[PDB]
Amino acid sequence: GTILIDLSPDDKEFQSVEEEMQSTVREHRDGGHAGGIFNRYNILKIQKVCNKKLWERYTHRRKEVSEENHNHANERMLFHGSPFVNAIIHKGFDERHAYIGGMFGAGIYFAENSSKSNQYVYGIGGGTGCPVHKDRSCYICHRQLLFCRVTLGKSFLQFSAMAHSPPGHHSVTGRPSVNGLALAEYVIYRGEQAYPEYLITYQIMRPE
Ligand SMILES: O=C(O)COc1ccc(-c2nc3ccccc3c(=O)[nH]2)cc1
Ligand SMILES: [Zn+2]
Questions:
Q1: Which end of the chain is more exposed for a tag (fewer CB within 10 A), N or C?
Q2: Which residues pair with 111 in a beta bridge?
Q3: Cα dist. 87→33, 91, 112 in Å?
Q4: Helix (H) or strand (E) holding 58
Q5: Domains: count for the chain
Q6: Which residues contact residue 51 at a Cβ distance below 8 angstroms, ignoring those fewer than 6 apart?
Q7: Which residue has its alpha carbon closest to ligand 1 atom 7?
Q8: Is 146 left (phi over 0), alpha (psi -120 to 50) or beta?
Q9: 125 ligand 1 Cβ < 6 A
Q10: Residue 50 is labelled as binding a ligand
Q11: Which residue ranges does the record assign to the PARP catalytic domain?
């Protein structure tokens, strides 16, 4: 059911997604071990992910959440990096895309910082890096991230340095409690609460 539509670099939509990607890069406490060393990206392509069935799955669940939370879906646009990106865009998010060992239990994790999601493109901890060169900081190989529409509903706040969401909540928020520059991370426990809106193809760029 999925089609991918290329956005032109001239399109205001391309430009606003690129800006969110670039402006949410930060330094990581691993010095770049997982995701590589970079301050910005080379954006090669941005595609809209269009799947009627998956869209309707997401909006159905969004209405349920909304109606459980005084007509407030608490919808965000967040990044997701995954070795399963090509399955997610065709079949949607589900229990197979969960981070079983994540800090907030088995769920599907999203980030405000694009560079945090970049650490997962080649797997947990960056895995063994790119398939071609076995390099977590590869500057040649093309990487992909998703920029996703995510329904948080009532989110349980965890202050901090598939399972079920906590009773009375639709999600968990991991609030950064030590690194003052880190943005929040989020976890949902139902795949229907995210839609993989944009597929972004990019390279990390070697600092000069
Ligand atoms: O590789 C596996 O075994 C299961 O596959 C995955 C797939 C994705 C992520 C993942 N974790 C995150 C944690 C915090 C913030 C953002 C993210 C993110 O973007 N992706 C972890 C494991
Ligand atoms: Zn490579």
A1: C
A2: 79, 185
A3: 26, 6, 22
A4: helix 52-67
A5: 1
A6: 1, 2, 3, 89, 90, 92
A7: 82
A8: beta
A9: no
A10: no
A11: 8-208
State which ligand 1 atom lies nearest to the alpha carbon of 79.
Answer: 19
The number of CA neighbours under 13 Å toward the Cβ of 194 is 32
Measured torsion, CA atoms of residues 152, 27, 124, 206, in degrees rounded to the nearest 10? 130
Question: Is ligand 1 within 6 A of the CB of residue 62?
Answer: no
* C-alpha torsion 92→36→159→16, nearest 10: -60
Q: Is 61 in the pocket of ligand 1 (CB under 6 A)?
A: no
Residues for the chain: how many in total?
A: 208
The H or E element spanning position 14 is helix 12-23
Distance of alpha carbon 121 from the chain centroid: 10
Experimental technique of record? X-ray
Q: How many whole angstroms from its chain centre is CA 127? A: 17
Ligand number nearest CA of 173 is: 1
Structural domain of 85: 1-208
Q: Whose CA is nearest to atom 11 of ligand 1?
A: 109
Structure tokens at 11: 């399109």
CATH of the domain at 148: 3.90.228.10
